[PDB]
Design a protein around this ligand. Structure first.
Ligand code: XO3
Length: 81
């Protein structure tokens, strides 16, 4: 769905920009940021492409590692189901 419920722990939409409009980094890349959550280690968390996800159950909801090297992560703006 292209919307989330609660903290979006199970969100599987395609939002790929942070709330500031910055392109998310691919969960499969290690640059500029080396992830703690990536597909190999977390194959059930939907860490596909550069989509915003919540593999760590952040109460603030889905987020992504960002392409900005001075911003490791940030939240995304996701529609509420
Ligand atoms: O690899 C990573 C992922 C993160 C963020 C991801 C969003 N949830 C944050 C949860 C959080 C916020 C503040 C303090 C502790 C944990 C941790 O930081 N490094």
């Amino acid at each position: 769905s292209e919307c989330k419920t609660g903290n979006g722990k199970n969100y599987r939409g395609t939002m790929s920009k942070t709330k500031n409009g910055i392109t998310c980094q691919k969960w499969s890349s290690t640059s500029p940021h080396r992830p703690r959550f990536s597909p190999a280690t977390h194959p059930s968390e939907g860490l596909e492409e550069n989509y915003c996800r919540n593999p760590d159950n952040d109460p603030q909801g889905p987020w992504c590692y960002t392409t900005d090297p001075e911003k490791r992560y940030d939240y995304c703006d996701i529609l509420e189901c």
